[PDB]
Design a protein around this motif. Structure first.
Motif, short mmCIF file in Angstrom:
data_model
loop_
_atom_site.label_atom_id
_atom_site.label_comp_id
_atom_site.label_asym_id
_atom_site.label_seq_id
_atom_site.Cartn_x
_atom_site.Cartn_y
_atom_site.Cartn_z
N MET A 205 0.82 -1.20 0.00
CA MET A 205 0.00 0.00 0.00
C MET A 205 0.86 1.26 0.00
O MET A 205 0.45 2.29 -0.55
N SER A 206 2.02 1.20 0.65
CA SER A 206 2.90 2.36 0.72
C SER A 206 3.59 2.62 -0.60
O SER A 206 3.91 3.78 -0.92
N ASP A 207 3.84 1.58 -1.39
CA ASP A 207 4.48 1.73 -2.70
C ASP A 207 3.97 0.65 -3.63
O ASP A 207 4.64 -0.36 -3.88
N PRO A 208 2.77 0.82 -4.18
CA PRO A 208 2.22 -0.24 -5.04
C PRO A 208 3.14 -0.63 -6.18
O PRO A 208 3.17 -1.81 -6.59
N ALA A 209 3.94 0.32 -6.68
CA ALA A 209 4.80 0.06 -7.82
C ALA A 209 5.90 -0.94 -7.51
O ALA A 209 6.50 -1.49 -8.45
N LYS A 210 6.20 -1.19 -6.24
CA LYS A 210 7.18 -2.22 -5.89
C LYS A 210 6.86 -3.56 -6.54
O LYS A 210 7.77 -4.31 -6.91
N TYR A 211 5.57 -3.87 -6.69
CA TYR A 211 5.11 -5.11 -7.30
C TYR A 211 4.41 -4.89 -8.64
O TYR A 211 3.68 -5.77 -9.10
N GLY A 212 4.64 -3.74 -9.27
CA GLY A 212 4.07 -3.45 -10.56
C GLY A 212 2.63 -3.00 -10.55
O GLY A 212 1.98 -3.04 -11.59
N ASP A 213 2.10 -2.61 -9.38
CA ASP A 213 0.73 -2.11 -9.34
C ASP A 213 0.72 -0.58 -9.47
O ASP A 213 1.70 0.09 -9.10
N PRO A 214 -0.36 -0.03 -10.01
CA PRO A 214 -0.44 1.42 -10.23
C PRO A 214 -0.55 2.20 -8.94
O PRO A 214 -1.21 1.79 -7.98
N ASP A 215 0.10 3.37 -8.94
CA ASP A 215 0.06 4.30 -7.82
C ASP A 215 -0.51 5.65 -8.24
O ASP A 215 -0.33 6.65 -7.54
N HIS A 216 -1.23 5.67 -9.36
CA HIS A 216 -1.79 6.89 -9.93
C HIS A 216 -2.87 6.49 -10.93
O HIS A 216 -2.72 5.48 -11.63
N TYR A 217 -3.93 7.29 -11.01
CA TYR A 217 -5.05 6.98 -11.89
C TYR A 217 -4.61 6.84 -13.34
O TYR A 217 -5.18 6.04 -14.09
N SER A 218 -3.59 7.60 -13.75
CA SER A 218 -3.15 7.54 -15.14
C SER A 218 -2.57 6.18 -15.48
O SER A 218 -2.45 5.85 -16.67
N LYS A 219 -2.22 5.38 -14.48
CA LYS A 219 -1.63 4.07 -14.68
C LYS A 219 -2.63 2.94 -14.48
O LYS A 219 -2.23 1.78 -14.45
N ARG A 220 -3.91 3.25 -14.36
CA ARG A 220 -4.89 2.21 -14.12
C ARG A 220 -4.91 1.19 -15.25
O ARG A 220 -4.74 1.51 -16.43
N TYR A 221 -5.10 -0.07 -14.86
CA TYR A 221 -5.25 -1.17 -15.79
C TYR A 221 -6.67 -1.17 -16.35
O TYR A 221 -7.64 -1.02 -15.60
N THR A 222 -6.78 -1.33 -17.67
CA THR A 222 -8.07 -1.28 -18.35
C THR A 222 -8.37 -2.56 -19.11
O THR A 222 -9.31 -2.57 -19.92
N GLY A 223 -7.61 -3.62 -18.89
CA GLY A 223 -7.87 -4.90 -19.51
C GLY A 223 -8.97 -5.68 -18.81
O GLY A 223 -9.64 -5.20 -17.89
N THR A 224 -9.16 -6.92 -19.26
CA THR A 224 -10.25 -7.75 -18.75
C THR A 224 -9.82 -8.74 -17.68
O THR A 224 -10.69 -9.30 -16.99
N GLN A 225 -8.52 -8.96 -17.50
CA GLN A 225 -8.05 -9.90 -16.50
C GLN A 225 -8.42 -9.42 -15.10
O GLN A 225 -8.59 -8.22 -14.85
N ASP A 226 -8.55 -10.37 -14.18
CA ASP A 226 -8.75 -10.03 -12.77
C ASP A 226 -10.00 -9.18 -12.58
O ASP A 226 -10.01 -8.23 -11.80
#
Ligand SMILES: O[C@@H]1[C@@H](O)[C@@H](O)OC[C@H]1O
Ligand SMILES: O[C@@H]1[C@@H](O)[C@@H](O)OC[C@H]1O
Ligand SMILES: O[C@@H]1[C@@H](O)[C@H](O)OC[C@H]1O
Ligand SMILES: O[C@@H]1[C@@H](O)[C@H](O)OC[C@H]1O
Ligand SMILES: O[C@@H]1[C@@H](O)[C@H](O)OC[C@H]1O
Ligand SMILES: O[C@@H]1[C@@H](O)[C@H](O)OC[C@H]1O
Ligand SMILES: O[C@@H]1[C@@H](O)[C@H](O)OC[C@H]1O
Ligand SMILES: O[C@@H]1[C@@H](O)[C@H](O)OC[C@H]1O
Ligand SMILES: O[C@@H]1[C@@H](O)[C@H](O)OC[C@H]1O
Ligand SMILES: O[C@@H]1[C@@H](O)[C@H](O)OC[C@H]1O
Ligand SMILES: O[C@@H]1[C@@H](O)[C@H](O)OC[C@H]1O
Ligand SMILES: [Ca+2]
Ligand SMILES: [Ca+2]
Ligand SMILES: [Ca+2]
Ligand SMILES: [Zn+2]
Ligand SMILES: [Zn+2]
Ligand SMILES: [Zn+2]
Ligand SMILES: [Zn+2]
Ligand SMILES: [Zn+2]
Ligand SMILES: [Zn+2]
Ligand SMILES: [Zn+2]
Length: 316
Positions: A205-226
């Motif tokens: 939660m403190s650094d989502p990008a450590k595991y490749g998760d977005p930390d900003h709305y501009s980086k949101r995933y828009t695919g169908t997985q998960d």
């Protein structure tokens, strides 16, 4: 079962000793009569039939390796109950003191844990990706918080609403972990994930990008997985919550931290009073701002910090 309320002792998945509330009638059962309409823990015996058998023990001592997942499922359900009651005046997951039922030893090598709509279900893991998942207090409380969500806002488990649903569970899972205050952090699942690797987790939660998760709305995933990225895009909200509590400067936006208790009060009010099944990130921001306004006043630091945190993650 009908019997005497007793207190047993045992060791959890990570080898730590704890007392557990049991009920005695010939055997000692994992039935805690001290919390609401009870906390009940069951053995699924490596099958998938639920709930299984109410956990029975001959001597009220739970130090066997086979006992450890049951000790933790039972004890951490109790902590989660105590958190919601003592911090939020909420009686069990439904607010009406529903019994909390959990089954352990579900299936074989099962790398998951879930609330199924009426009970908790814990796999034992495969011993490499996970050890028995009830060993993680944040996992236990994350999943029980899905029940809280189901009984309140009803957030749907897809797209932005589903990412909020996930983040709510990570936020309260972490706040329960801090409420116990044994080994808290802003990571999810660190106690039970990858026993051969220290210092990792399922997500940060403190650094989502450590595991490749977005930390900003501009980086949101828009695919169908998960289901549209519900465990991925949760990073955007998790980061906002972390900033509200702890403060920091993120993408050039400074956030004044207000601490964990106020984070929990703001998000609990948002969830129970303002969110709806299809709330999006912008609507969550509005709900959090309104909740902080209700609790602390429109001119408060708390409101300002909520706005700063959502600004920092790009949610207007
Ligand atoms: O699945 C069974 C459950 O229904 C109950 O009867 O307790 C024992 C279990 O074997
Ligand atoms: O009764 C409802 C139950 O069916 C489920 O939907 O969870 C929330 C409750 O309000
Ligand atoms: O309902 C509970 C009962 O099952 C137990 O035996 O003792 C306490 C009661 O509250
Ligand atoms: O080391 C733990 C042990 O103390 C407990 O008794 O059983 C599970 C193990 O993980
Ligand atoms: O699950 C069983 C429970 O229903 C009964 O009351 O006591 C024995 C358990 O095996
Ligand atoms: O049963 C033993 C227990 O009494 C002790 O507390 O820890 C070691 C266990 O084997
Ligand atoms: O447009 C965004 C910018 O405003 C922010 O500062 O960092 C991420 C960018 O995508
Ligand atoms: O594609 C979806 C996107 O439009 C939304 O913004 O965030 C969730 C995604 O599933
Ligand atoms: O969400 C609120 C709802 O719970 C209440 O019942 O009516 C007003 C709404 O603001
Ligand atoms: O109606 C508003 C809702 O959309 C928002 O999400 O939470 C605050 C409410 O005032
Ligand atoms: O209006 C605010 C109120 O809602 C709350 O009690 O905190 C102080 C006031 O400023
Ligand atoms: Ca025993
Ligand atoms: Ca954690
Ligand atoms: Ca690990
Ligand atoms: Zn889950
Ligand atoms: Zn979840
Ligand atoms: Zn921890
Ligand atoms: Zn997922
Ligand atoms: Zn999940
Ligand atoms: Zn940053
Ligand atoms: Zn930061």
């Amino acid at each position: 079962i009908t019997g005497t309320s007793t207190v047993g002792v045992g060791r959890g998945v990570l080898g730590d000793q704890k007392n557990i509330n049991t009920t005695y009638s010939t055997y000692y059962y994992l039935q805690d009569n001290t919390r609401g309409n009870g906390i009940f823990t069951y053995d699924a015996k490596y099958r998938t039939t639920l709930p299984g058998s109410l956990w029975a023990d001959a001597d009220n001592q739970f130090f066997a390796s086979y006992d450890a997942p049951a000790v933790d499922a039972h004890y951490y359900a109790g902590v989660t109950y105590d958190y919601y009651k003592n911090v939020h005046n909420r009686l069990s997951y439904d607010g009406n003191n529903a019994a909390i039922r959990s089954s352990v030893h579900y299936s074989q090598g099962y790398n998951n844990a879930f609330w199924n709509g009426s009970q908790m279900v814990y796999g034992d893991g495969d011993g490499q990706t996970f050890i028995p998942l009830s060993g993680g207090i944040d996992v236990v409380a994350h999943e029980l918080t899905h029940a809280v969500t189901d009984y309140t806002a009803g957030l749907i488990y897809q797209n932005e609403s589903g990412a909020i649903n996930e983040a709510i569970s990570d936020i309260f899972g972490t706040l329960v972990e801090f409420y116990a205050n044994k080994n808290p952090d802003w990571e999810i699942g660190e106690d039970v994930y990858t026993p051969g690797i220290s210092g990792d987790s399922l997500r940060s939660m403190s650094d989502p990008a450590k595991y490749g998760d977005p930390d900003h709305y501009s980086k949101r995933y828009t695919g169908t997985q998960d289901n549209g990225g519900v465990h991925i895009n949760s990073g955007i909200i998790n980061k906002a919550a972390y900033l509200i509590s702890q403060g920091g400067t993120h993408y050039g936006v400074s956030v004044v931290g207000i601490g964990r208790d106020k984070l929990g009060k703001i998000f609990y009010r948002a969830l129970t009073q303002y969110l709806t099944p299809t709330s999006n990130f912008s609507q969550l921001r509005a709900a959090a701002v309104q909740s902080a306004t209700d609790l602390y006043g429109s001119t408060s630091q708390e409101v300002a910090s909520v706005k700063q945190a959502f600004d920092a993650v790009g949610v207007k």
